[PDB]
Amino acid sequence: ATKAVAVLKGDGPVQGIINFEQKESNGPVKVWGSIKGLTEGLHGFHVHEEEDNTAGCTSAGPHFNPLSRKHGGPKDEERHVGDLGNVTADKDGVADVSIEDSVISLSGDHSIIGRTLVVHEKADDLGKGGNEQSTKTGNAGSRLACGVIGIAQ
Ligand SMILES: [Cu+]
Numbered sequence: 001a002t003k004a005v006a007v008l009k010g011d012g013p014v015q016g017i018i019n020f021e022q023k024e025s026n027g028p029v030k031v032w033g034s035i036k037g038l039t040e041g042l043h044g045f046h047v048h049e050e051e052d053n054t055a056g057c058t059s060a061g062p063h064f065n066p067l068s069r070k071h072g073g074p075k076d077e078e079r080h081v082g083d084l085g086n087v088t089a090d091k092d093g094v095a096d097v098s099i100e101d102s103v104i105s106l107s108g109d110h111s112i113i114g115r116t117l118v119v120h121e122k123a124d125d126l127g128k129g130g131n132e133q134s135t136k137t138g139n140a141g142s143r144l145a146c147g148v149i150g151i152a153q
């Protein structure tokens, strides 16, 4: 779409308004956001499968993997569909996201509308930890907050 949002929220007051703009069927998306309630430091950020509560928190399915690759980040050879590596939280526990991608579509085959955008405690290990868990998740640990990607309104 040309205006999508994902309101992150967790067990605690950790919350974050993510924004996504695509417009173009096959153009570079802009993705950005601003958490409020993480700790400082790097936090893994990914599009988990779908709004699947049974996966643990309010919703957080496995790392979405349509092409069935190993985990990593935008700069890796092995990166899943929604492997937006990690973001950096401030000393005030705010991680201002601002990146762009061309794998997804927000409106098309890879409509991210409906997906489950989740933040992790630890840094994404860029799926290089040489262990399934890491090479599937980034060893980023438990999901401080979870959320769903929808239309901005
Ligand atoms: Cu994740």
Ligand SMILES: [Zn+2]
Residues within 6 Å of the ligand: 046, 063, 064, 070, 071, 072, 079, 080, 082, 083, 136, 137
């Ligand atoms: Zn991944």
